[PDB]
Symmetry: none
Subunit: 116 residues, 4 copies
Amino acid sequence: CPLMVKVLDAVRGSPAINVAVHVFRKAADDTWEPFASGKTSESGELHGLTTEEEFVEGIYKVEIDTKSYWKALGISPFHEHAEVVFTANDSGPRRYTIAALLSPYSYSTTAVVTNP
Amino acid sequence: CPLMVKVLDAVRGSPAINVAVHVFRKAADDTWEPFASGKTSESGELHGLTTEEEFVEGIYKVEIDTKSYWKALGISPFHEHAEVVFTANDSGPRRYTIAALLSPYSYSTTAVVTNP
Amino acid sequence: CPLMVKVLDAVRGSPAINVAVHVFRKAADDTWEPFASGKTSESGELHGLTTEEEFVEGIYKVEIDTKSYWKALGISPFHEHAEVVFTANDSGPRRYTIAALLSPYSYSTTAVVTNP
Amino acid sequence: CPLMVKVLDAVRGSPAINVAVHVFRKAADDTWEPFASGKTSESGELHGLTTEEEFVEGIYKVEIDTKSYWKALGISPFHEHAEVVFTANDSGPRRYTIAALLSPYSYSTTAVVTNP
Ligand SMILES: [Re]
Ligand SMILES: [Re]
Ligand SMILES: [Re]
Ligand SMILES: [Re]
């Protein structure tokens, strides 16, 4: 419940299905440790990355790999990786939605952060 | 010139060229009155809409004829047109740049106000 | 189920609660007829505007009035109305989400259009 | 100059001034190599990053130090920095303009490619 990633295609007005998502957390030594991963559903969303027990304060990186999405559309992408880096839970637990909007020459990302 | 409009196409990664733009100003009876109109240049820009003297404080609406633009490129888009409203306060001379970024199912608009 | 409007605040990373939403449909005579209305919930979303029986093909306008949201934040907005106009159901029934992202000097809107 | 970066602040409706920008180029071993860096001017622009000869085909990452920018304005933002990737193909001379629009919880990036 506390972390959900959503990916949308601005050209098609559609969810982006089968986008690979990787989450890393910055460790003590300043390296990126693996945290969680998954693939977006039919609705362009990925739920169940983590639990409130595991999603502690820290610096997180969310990566998306869109190759499979673009190729399913018959598109040969010129690049296919996007990353965002943020601080989480630093004023207490919140629920986070990280949304990306894709097009060929533009990219947006927005975070919505709510209470219970 | 105190008012410029700039339009960008996120599908082509290009200025949006020859796009029709209409600017309206809210009248005292709450109707939108025509103010100026034009078509974007080869750089995606439209200047010469107003002199400094004609550009008074008020609530302005910029309407961008995205429908015709996308259809001319063989694309059937979502919106009939793109619209943004912006307010000009009274001030010393200020330049207002209205920037739109277009995709077939999404757009974003920003008003940049600078003291020249 | 077929039409949902969502409004988000990009400054705060939050849903925009109590935003008034009005939907109009273009009639035979080219006037805008009232269609539906409501207010966004805690989650920034408004569901239950219409039913598949009523949401027929046509040209629709979705208006938002953000005054109550901004004033609750202690903000005195310089304008507080946004509109989008689109064609619906023209290739068969779809579900539509119309999302707006607000900030003081920018505005985005995106439509996501899916099947069952 | 064939590469320019432009950064806009959606909270203030202004160019984002004195913002640090780093540009990296992907190397043959898949690492990001430093390419150039600078700070935005009073118009929100950064030019002089590269000569035409140094700007070869490749995959480029533009990192914008949004964290420091927002903190300097008294705002605690979501992202540690903003990142966009763009690819340059081999071609006749082309100008690449990378445009970012910043809010504390959202940003959008676009690559505009023009034939001068
Ligand atoms: Re991508
Ligand atoms: Re404004
Ligand atoms: Re608004
Ligand atoms: Re690109």
